Each structure stands twice: as C-alpha cells, then as structure tokens.
C-alpha cells in the first residue's frame, strides 16, 4: 500500500513560535511537531472523514480533534471527527491526554474504521481531542498524529493501526518504509520500493521495544570524532520530526565547525576560568574523567553539568591529539556556541561551501550528511535564513544518551521500519 506524503517545509512562523516556547524518561513529552514537514491523509469513520496527520514512528497513538472540542482556539483551525455522522462508530469514553514538548492534548477514546490509502482498519481505537492547548497546535498544518510506534508507549494501551492492519490481514510483509525525498515523499505499509533507494539496506535491530530505537555509534564531523558517542549512543528514527536531536556536547562541537550561531553560556565560561586548568591537568594526568568533576568538587548541579561537558570536549581534544596550550581556549570558544533553546542556530547560507560533511556510524557504516542536507533554508532567497538541522536533546540520562534522527537523516536515507524482524534499515534515498 502506497501512502503519498506532502512536504510543507518549515517556514518563518514556526521558528518564531518554537523560539517563544525534560529528559528523565519520556521523549514523547519532548516532541515538537512544529518541526514536522511531511503530512499524509487518513480517514476515520464510515463514510471516511478526512484528516491531515503526521505519520509518526515516535508515537503509538492516533488522535484527531473532536467535534466536542469547544474551547481550544486551535480546534477552530483544524478538522473535527463527528462521531454521529459515522455509521461504524463505537463509543469508548475512556479519557486520555498526551503531553508533548510544545503542546498537550486531552480527550476521550472512541473507535471506528481508519483508512490509510486503501486499507480500512476496523475497530481502530483512537483519541478524539476535546482540548489541545499548546503553540504546536496553534500553528499546526496537520490535524492529528497517526502513531507508527510500539504499543508499549501507547496512551491507554491502545492497539496501534499498524498492529491492526498487520494482523487483520491488510499488509503483505510486516514492514513499512518511508521515502521522504521525492524531489514530497511516500510511506508504504507492508513493503518498500526498490526504486526509492540506491543499493541494499543496512539493518540494525531494535534495542528497546517501545521506541523504534537502535544502538548507534559515533558521530564524526569532517572526519573527526566527537568522542561523546564513540562508546555508543542510542537513536530513534522518528518521522514525526525533522531536526536531528542529540547531546549538547556534540551539538556544541557541530556549531563550532559548522558556524551555527549558538548562545553564550556563563557556567561554561565559568568552569573554563575557575576550573579549566584543574580539569585539563587531571585529564593530562590521565585521571578517570567520571571522577574529575567529583574530585574537582563540582558533582550545584547546573554547574556540574557544564563541567561534565567541559571534561568531554577536553578528552576529545586530547583524543584528537590537539596541543594542550590551545585546548582551554578552544573549550572556551565552544562555551560561546551553546545550543540556544530559543534562538535558532542560524548559519550563513553562502557558508555551506566550506562546511564539513558530518557522519554517524550505524551498523558499522558511516552515514554521511552533506552540508546541503543538514542545513535547512527557511525564507526568502536574498534574505533567506539557513539553520543547523540539529537540536540539543540532552540525551535521556540512563534512558540512554540518545539521538532522534528525523527528516534531516530520513530524508537522505530510505528507512525501513521492520516490525517482523524488529529492526530498522537505512539505504541511500534515490
């Protein structure tokens, strides 16, 4: 089954909105859909009521606004499910609400027949939004989210549309792929088109069944490592997002080498002066890095985090055999490129010429991303506005320091979410 997608590229209004707007656990509460660029259509009910939705590998719920949503100004800009105008409707008033990064939705469950392409998924239980506050839904160019993730992370434990279609007998292979590079795109449930990619797919298994997350490796920028992820890093291939979200340590090194704006951090300028040489010498003395911020006496917390990071940038500078006398002054500069959680990390659009391809190691393979794949342009030519397609998600501690690979990576790389073989696979997009 072939599901076309339309690409509505991030514009000026979403950036100003994202600008004027967690970690321990939930990545769902971390999602920002204003960073969505590919939309599809489904239909809930009989006859089919049409809704633009985001096909999200990073969520496991389907939800659409309810006709019963009277108070959110957002519901007055999006479509609504009218249960009574639907023959096949079954009422499951179980209340529910999902908190995401730039918004929230609360409503109650219900059921009906959902239609993707030409599959009529019956009994599909879903959430009708009786309220959906947040700026993500104010600016939204979609109506719902159709979750393509695992049931484990499903609100109210509802059975996803994929589980239903890939059981009721609707799909061929219990696989599905996204080709977000129709230079629009296209999802295909139960298969994949060998015309959407060059060569074979590198398959790495799903490590934690909840998210479509696999164990990735290192991140290199311009050939040089970032060190932080060399010892492994989790990743979630999420099609309900664009920007690549990773550790702040790595992102701050990428902004330097890429020339991305970045905000000035004082705690960092502080660890540099006050503790700079202490940390370095401890590293030169080959003291255990973990033990450094503890010995040096910094591990309140906000300062301990600037230190931990400082230590990591330093080990890589030493790891890259860089001369000591410059490491402090270097780590001092990164302190000026901290990822701004508001102001976009804008890059000069002409400066793409001298940018370094960054790469990620997955499956033993290094998947490169040229500067014209990882920098986004959001504006009017002459005065357009390019930005680093990276974000700082301070990797859910112990929930795995992780990356979220979306449109920016899944755009250049054909992704095949393999449910039967519980693994993901990447191929060069055609």
UniProtKB/Swiss-Prot annotation:
GO molecular function annotation: aspartic-type endopeptidase activity
Enzyme class: hydrolase
GO terms of biological process kind: lipid metabolic process; proteolysis
Subcellular location: Vacuole
Disulfide bond sites: 69-75, 229-233, 268-335, 293-307, 299-304, 349-386
Residues forming coiled coils: none
Domain of life, per lineage: Eukaryota
Peptidase A1 domain sequence ranges: 38-400
Active site location: 56, 238
Function of the molecule: Involved in the breakdown of propeptides of storage proteins in protein-storage vacuoles.
Protein name as it appears in the record: Phytepsin
Organism: Hordeum vulgare (Barley)
Lineage: Eukaryota, Viridiplantae, Streptophyta, Embryophyta, Tracheophyta
């Amino acid at each position: 089954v072939r599901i076309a997608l339309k690409k509505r590229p991030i514009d000026r209004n979403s950036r100003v909105a994202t600008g004027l707007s967690e970690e321990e656990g939930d990545i769902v509460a971390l999602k920002n859909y204003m960073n969505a660029q590919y939309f599809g259509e489904i239909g809930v009910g009989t006859p089919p009521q049409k809704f633009t939705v985001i096909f999200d590998t990073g969520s496991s719920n389907l939800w659409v606004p309810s006709a019963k949503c009277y108070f959110s100004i957002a519901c007055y800009l999006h479509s609504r499910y009218k249960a009574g105008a639907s023959s096949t409707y079954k009422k499951n008033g179980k209340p529910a609400a999902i908190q995401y990064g730039t918004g929230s939705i609360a409503g109650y469950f219900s059921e009906d027949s959902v239609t993707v392409g030409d599959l009529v998924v019956k009994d599909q239980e879903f959430i009708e939004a009786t309220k959906e506050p947040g700026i993500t839904f104010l600016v939204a160019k979609f109506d719902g989210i159709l979750g393509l993730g695992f049931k484990e992370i499903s609100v109210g434990k509802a059975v996803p549309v994929w589980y239903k279609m890939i059981e009721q007998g609707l799909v061929s292979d219990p696989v599905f792929s996204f080709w977000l590079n129709r230079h629009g795109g296209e999802i295909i449930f139960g298969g994949m088109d060998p015309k959407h990619y060059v060569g074979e797919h590198t398959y790495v298994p799903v490590t934690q069944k909840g998210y479509w997350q696999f164990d990735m490796g290192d991140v290199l920028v311009g050939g040089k490592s970032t060190g932080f992820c060399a010892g492994g890093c989790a990743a979630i291939a999420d099609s309900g997002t664009s920007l690549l979200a990773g550790p702040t340590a790595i992102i701050t090194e990428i902004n330097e080498k890429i020339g991305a704006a970045g905000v000035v951090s004082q705690e960092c300028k502080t660890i540099v002066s006050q503790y700079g040489q202490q940390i370095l010498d401890l590293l030169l003395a080959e003291t255990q890095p973990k033990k450094i911020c503890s010995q040096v006496g910094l591990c309140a917390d906000p300062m301990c985090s600037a230190c931990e990071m400082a230590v990591v940038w330093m080990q890589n500078q030493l790891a890259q055999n860089k001369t000591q006398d410059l490491i402090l002054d270097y780590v001092n500069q990164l302190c000026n490129r901290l990822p701004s959680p508001m102001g976009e990390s804008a890059v000069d659009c002409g400066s793409l010429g001298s940018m370094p391809d960054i790469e990620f190691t997955i499956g033993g393979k290094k998947f490169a991303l040229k500067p014209e794949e990882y920098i986004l342009k959001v504006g009017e030519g002459a005065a357009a506005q390019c930005i680093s397609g990276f974000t700082a998600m301070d990797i859910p501690p112990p929930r795995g320091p992780l990356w979220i690979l979306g449109d920016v990576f899944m755009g250049p790389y054909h992704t095949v979410f393999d449910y039967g073989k519980l693994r993901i696979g990447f191929a060069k997009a055609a």
